[PDB]
């Protein structure tokens, strides 16, 4: 029954909020729909894999909140393998390379590629992290899909192909499905293109030893009986003095404040009394999550390393089921594995096949890309289709279709009476990531602390000290990168 | 507890399904979330208005299912007033006209306007009503917004402006919000541009005497205690032999089959066991409803008629709160009124104002458009913002953003075990309308009858005899309308001569 705060959702965001409030002296309850915590993170353990992240996994520099929370819980990171060469596979052929960006030799194509990445960041600089709808050209950019933007910007098919893959991989959605404004905000709020795409010195630098699921599990250990599993919330009543929260099994919870720490659209699963304000009522029908299958193929050995390949493959083309891979071998060098993503429309298309059929296609692809018959001999396979999850709705995160961010965006974290809003979608830095989940949960918790008169308004938004374990190198450009003309710019010079 | 079929939702679709099943001998229960039936139709009665439709209202020729159902329930229609001139208001000036389409005098603009409407119908002919994702260019058209299509097709601002208003009015959404494929399907499945936009001989020809809400109310009367009000469904369990359906107040209902007769996205309000198939699970998060406020301003007299205006206004421009009106006077000539829609982004924008502030802006607009000070003297005002409805989600209906119809479209009315799907969104003819609600409800009901071995597969989809009361005149084109070139077509005819 009674407590100070009910938190709806036991993912990283809900757990972080609950930890903060509990450490501040309040009585908190976490209501979780599944028989487990973690949400969009899930670590599977069995003898064949030891442990594997089937959901959220990667952390890197500038993600200081998730790193500090994990460190406090007694967790360690290790570096994703990027010692050897990356592979760009394009039109049925593999081109090994070094550095974050796949290189280009044709001069016209070079200019086009250079201008695309640069323009993404140029446009991002006009978009406020905490208020993307306040961009000077917000409406113009929001009334346009990323497909339209790419059609105008890319003068070569080569740049357009890579840009499309870039969009598919970042947000598990097609270019024609997403707002240009929203996608430009999304990249900007992760620190730009270099930071978002990079393993070394970027978002995919590291994973947690033992899996990311330990973050939520260990916070549950700290909270003891305060976490209630298999308690899907169905009903929130705010008509009386105290907020009443009902779960599917008929249990009642009474609190002064609620934190909603679920994906925005999953708010639809709750019946509200009184009805939600009009803008939120419509917003939560307008914000889907992307489509992805995460697949891990295991091998006797990390054989790609012998050929001077790190395990990273960037794979172009409709025929390829997987567009991107990383080495998923344990830091000890055992349980050799390749992690790959099946993205967007391919996730919908290939879901019809059996587990075995998907494994076959992946192995045959990897054999082609790595130029190795050894890829045809998997020892084990694990996979997760996130599209099928009732209490996630997809992965990695929520995308905004054209028109929505300007019309409904300011409503996302606006409190509804005594309901405050967490969840990675409401963060201002690395929204969509585990880092954003921590930012949003702790911020929502502090909003309630302020409403209780426990802290000054000053302290709702708090900066984070840089991790000593994962220091950030700054993102640099060269003189030529900054000043080389676009394709149309070169044509004007002619 | 126990019955043959549980119907979720007591709108026109749910009520039509329940009536059919009940008339066939089965024991049916209707579970309705609100304290009333009707859903997106709602008739308000008070002394000032007598009665008024605050939601769905208009019916017309080719809508034979809603007309037959209403007639069986003892209802009558009357004709919306279109005796006098329509008004097209553009750039702060009114131009009176007759006929369905606002006329154009500039020859270049004429070609552009003619080609736009023609192309909409041309493209529609390639789109199967029952399977829009099967169109030859389905993917190309679906990966494009209506805004992109309009930018390529309209060579004049005048055509683009009117086309934009056309999209806003048909589907209560912005051109940049909606898939081109989906919108083209939507128009086609209503019988084309002429049929969808027309009062006389089209969708807006008639209303029901006493209001459309009587349709659902009278079916409830026929069903008696079988309709359960204030029973929002929260949980559907299909793991056991019989389907278990739970409501918010903890009541349990057990049935052989369920009809879901709610807007697709509102399926999100229900927790499923076992979980929904993956494609439906994602589909119901991808399909929002549009935004609209329906507003009715009352006057002492239908004064616009004296100036030879019927009361129809097509109003262009960002500054205008209302883009479309119709005369809403009773057939007796009393309770003189103007009905207007506040559409899409304007519904969101002007919702912040008070009721009084909205009334003021409408009167001042009407005064300008009708050139009449009398418009500044309203005697009464009613309005409904459908965006604020938890158990509707918006109005009139569900739109599909770019990319969705081809990826998830075939899932819309695909049964999930013993759950079958009604609701106007699943219809193949006048989806989005009361007609589509009747088609979908009765078809879903017959799907269950077939599964029970009561009828042949042959009989699931049934044609409807034409109404004798509301006959349909065919849609005709002229020779010039068919063969006049587009703007780019004329330019090609010029480039050819210059050689
Ligand atoms: C799925 C995915 C995500 C992902 C990723 C790869 C995949 C396949 N890669 C990542 C990466 O490597 N690095 C990274 O930082 N993140 C990446 N992600 C995304 C990341 O996992 C998410 O951003 C993050 O986990 C989101 O956390 P958040 O706490 O904000 O949201 P959640 O995990 O979805 O938690 C919500 C919980 O609420 C429960 N729920 C839902 N509805 C109810 C109701 N009605 N009542 C009670 N509880 C409810 C859910 O069950 C869930 O536990
Ligand atoms: C809103 C609107 C609609 C409209 C219109 C103008 C406005 C402002 N103009 C129309 C026009 O003049 N001509 C016409 O034919 N229709 C036009 N419309 C659209 C029309 O009203 C709709 O197409 C039609 O009414 C839809 O009927 P349907 O039966 O398919 O759907 P519904 O009316 O929304 O009914 C759904 C019912 O289900 C209940 N509900 C929702 N969730 C639950 C749960 N979880 N449990 C139990 N019941 C639930 C709703 O309360 C509703 O009653
Ligand atoms: C993008 C890599 C890239 C590099 C070059 C060209 C195109 C793409 C990584 C983005 C990512 C990876 C994994 C989870 C989230 C985001
Ligand atoms: C469109 C009229 C029109 C006529 C000419 C130009 C542009 C628009 C009517 C559509 C409509 C009206 C009422 C509810 C549903 C649909």
From Swiss-Prot, chain B:
Compartments (UniProt record): Mitochondrion outer membrane
Top-level taxonomic group: Eukaryota
Example GO biological process: substantia nigra development
SUPFAM superfamilies: FAD-linked reductases, C-terminal domain, FAD/NAD(P)-binding domain
Site feature (Important for catalytic activity) residues: 154, 363, 380
GO MF term list: electron transfer activity; flavin adenine dinucleotide binding; monoamine oxidase activity; primary methylamine oxidase activity
Top-tier EC class: oxidoreductase
Catalyzed reaction equations: a secondary aliphatic amine + O2 + H2O = a primary amine + an aldehyde + H2O2; (R)-adrenaline + O2 + H2O = (R)-3,4-dihydroxymandelaldehyde + methylamine + H2O2; a primary methyl amine + O2 + H2O = an aldehyde + H2O2 + NH4(+); benzylamine + O2 + H2O = benzaldehyde + H2O2 + NH4(+)
Modified residues (S-8alpha-FAD cysteine): 395
Effect of mutating residue 156 to A: Dramatic loss of activity
Enzyme nomenclature, EC number: 1.4.3.21, 1.4.3.4
Stretches in topological domain Cytoplasmic: 1-487
Any Pfam family the entry gives: Amino_oxidase
Cofactor(s) needed by this chain: FAD
Alphabetical UniProt keywords: Acetylation, FAD, Flavoprotein, Membrane, Mitochondrion, Mitochondrion outer membrane, Oxidoreductase, Transmembrane, Transmembrane helix
Record-level GO cellular component terms: mitochondrial envelope; mitochondrial outer membrane; mitochondrion
Effect of residue 395 to S: Complete loss of activity
Keyword Transmembrane helix: yes
Positions of modified residues (N6-acetyllysine): 50
Regulation (activators, inhibitors): Inhibited by deprenyl.
Bilayer topology: Single-pass type IV membrane protein
Effect of residue 387 to A: Complete loss of activity
Outcome after substituting residue 3 to S: No loss of activity
Presence of the UniProt keyword Cell membrane in the record: no
Main function: Catalyzes the oxidative deamination of primary and some secondary amines such as neurotransmitters, and exogenous amines including the tertiary amine, neurotoxin 1-methyl-4-phenyl-1,2,3,6-tetrahydropyridine (MPTP), with concomitant reduction of oxygen to hydrogen peroxide and participates in the metabolism of neuroactive and vasoactive amines in the central nervous system and peripheral tissues. Preferentially degrades benzylamine and phenylethylamine.
Protein name: Amine oxidase [flavin-containing] B
Lineage: Eukaryota, Metazoa, Chordata, Craniata, Vertebrata
